[PDB]
From a paper:
Here we used a pair of thermophilic/mesophilic acylphosphatases homologues (acylphosphatase from hyperthermophilic archaeon Pyrococcus horikoshii (PhAcP) and human common-type acylphosphatase (HuAcP)) as a model to study how local flexibility of the active site affects the enzymatic activity. Despite remarkable conservation of sequence and structure at the active site, the catalytic activity of the thermophilic PhAcP is significantly poorer as compared with its mesophilic homologue HuAcP at low temperatures. The salt-bridge between the active-site residue Arg-20 and the C-terminal carboxyl group is found only in thermophilic PhAcP but not in mesophilic HuAcP.
Firstly, the C-terminal residue of HuAcP was substituted with a glycine residue (HuG99) to engage the salt-bridge with the active-site arginine residue. Crystal structures of HuA99 and HuG99, resolved at 1.5 Å and 1.7 Å, respectively, demonstrated that they were superimposable with a Cα r.m.s.d. value of 0.17 Å. In a good agreement with our original design, the salt-bridge between the C-terminal carboxyl group of Gly-99 and Arg-23 at the active site was only detected in HuG99, but not in the pseudo-wild-type HuA99. Regarding the Arrhenius plot, both HuG99 and HuA99 exhibited straight lines that intersected also roughly at 298 K. The salt-bridge bearing variant HuG99 illustrated a steeper slope of the Arrhenius plot, i.e. a stronger temperature dependency of the enzymatic activity, as compared to that of HuA99 lacking the salt-bridge. Importantly, the activation energy (52.5±2.5 kJmol−1) for HuG99 was analogous to that for PhWT (49.1±1.4 kJmol−1), while the activation energy for HuA99 (29.5±1.9 kJmol−1) and HuWT (37.6±3.1 kJmol−1) was comparable to that for PhG91A (32.1±1.7 kJmol−1). The distance between the C-terminal carboxyl group and the guanido group of the active-site arginine residue was less than 4 Å throughout the entire simulation of PhWT and HuG99, denoting the presence of the salt-bridges in these proteins. In the simulations of the salt-bridge bearing PhWT and HuG99, the side-chains of the arginine residues populated mainly the native mtm180° rotamer conformation.
Numbering used by the authors: 3 to 98
The structure:
């Protein structure tokens, strides 16, 4: 059992109408992460990532430069980066 972290994310850019949520869920699962992703009312994509630090950090880089193939990302805001006792999530859902 490694040090587990959680981080909140919000992604600004051409991120809706580009299958962003599907590809986020897929990549999170590929990297062994749990959490969630949704569209927000301000046109951004938002969620949390939880998992081992190297895995979360990789997904953070994904969210900074890549996302779904047709998306382009202006900014990824991260906050509430915290060490956690255990995962709060058992899967990675698209929730909104």
């Amino acid at each position: 059992g490694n040090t587990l972290i959680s981080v909140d994310y919000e992604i600004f850019g051409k991120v809706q109408g580009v299958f962003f949520r599907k590809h986020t869920q897929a990549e999170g699962k590929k990297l062994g992460l749990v959490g969630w992703v949704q569209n927000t009312d301000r046109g951004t994509v938002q969620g949390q990532l939880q998992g081992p630090i190297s895995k979360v950090r990789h997904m953070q880089e994904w969210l900074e430069t890549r996302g779904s193939p047709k998306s382009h990302i202006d900014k990824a805001n991260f906050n509430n980066e915290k060490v956690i006792l255990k995962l709060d999530y058992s899967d990675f859902q698209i929730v909104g």
